[PDB]
Design brief:
- It comes from Homo sapiens.
- This is Factor VII light chain.
- This protein is mostly beta strands.
- It has one domain: Ribbon (Laminin), CATH 2.10.25.10.
- 0% of the residues lie in helices and 26% in strands.
- It has no helices and four strands.
- The chain has a two-stranded antiparallel ribbon with strand order 1-2. The protein has a two-stranded antiparallel ribbon with strand order 3-4.
- A hairpin with a 5-residue loop joins strand 3 and strand 4.
- The protein starts with 15 loop residues before the first strand and ends in a 6-residue tail after the last strand.
- Bound molecules: alpha-L-fucopyranose (FUC).
- Alpha-L-fucopyranose (FUC) binds next to loops.
Length: 46
């Protein structure tokens, strides 16, 4: 009962949305980045 910021799935790139205290959190893979998982980390050779 601390606000629901996971109704329209704010996460992206198949990110997992989880309702947390105050705000929320997007659980994604280690190869992804960004607040809403919208930055595919494709480097490999970098
Ligand atoms: C939610 O967590 C993320 C990290 C991925 O494993 C998703 O497939 C899962 O549903």
């Amino acid at each position: 009962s601390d606000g629901d910021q996971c109704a329209s799935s704010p996460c992206q790139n198949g990110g997992s949305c989880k309702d947390q205290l105050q705000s929320y959190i997007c659980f994604c893979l280690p190869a992804f980045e960004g607040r809403n998982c919208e930055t595919h980390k494709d480097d490999g050779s970098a």
